[PDB]
Amino acid sequence: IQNRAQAVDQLRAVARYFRQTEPHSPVAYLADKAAEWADMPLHKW
Amino acid sequence: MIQNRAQAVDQLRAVARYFRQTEPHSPVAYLADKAAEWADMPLHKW
C-alpha cells in the first residue's frame, strides 16, 4: 500500500468480501464500520 | 482481487498496519485493528 487512497480501496474491498461471505458476523460489522469512518476523516472521535 | 478468506484476512491485516503507521490515533486504525483480531477467531453460523 503506497498511500491512503489505496489503503481505503483495499479496506472497502475487504469489507465487501466479509459482508458477502459472513454477513451477520462481528467481523463484517467491524470491517464495514472501519470503511465508514475512513470516509469521515473530519468527524471528531 | 481477494480469492479466498485467508487472502481477505491478509489484506485486512495489511490495511490495519498501514493505518496504525500513518494514523495511529484515528477511528480507522482502531477499527481495522479490531476487525483483524476478530477475523482470527474461530468461525460460527452467524
Numbering used by the authors:
A (entry chain A): 303 to 347
B (entry chain B): 302 to 347
What is written in the article reporting this PDB entry?
Nested deletion of consecutive helical segments of TssA1B CTD revealed that loss of α15 resulted in the failure of the protein to assemble into a high molecular weight ring, and structure determination of the construct H12–H14 (helices α12–α14) and of that consisting of α12 and α13 alone (residues 303–347), revealed them both to be dimers. In the assembled Bc TssA1B CTD ring, analysis by PISA32 revealed an extensive dimer interface (~950 Å2) between monomers in the different layers, which principally involves the interaction of residues located in helices α12–α13 with their two-fold related subunits forming a region of hydrophobic packing with hydrophilic interactions at the periphery.
Consistent with this, phylogenetic analysis has suggested that the TssA family can be subdivided into three clades (TssA1, TssA2 and TssA3). The structural studies presented here show that TssA1B, TssA2A and TssA2B possess structurally diverse CTDs that lead to distinct overall architectures for their respective complexes.
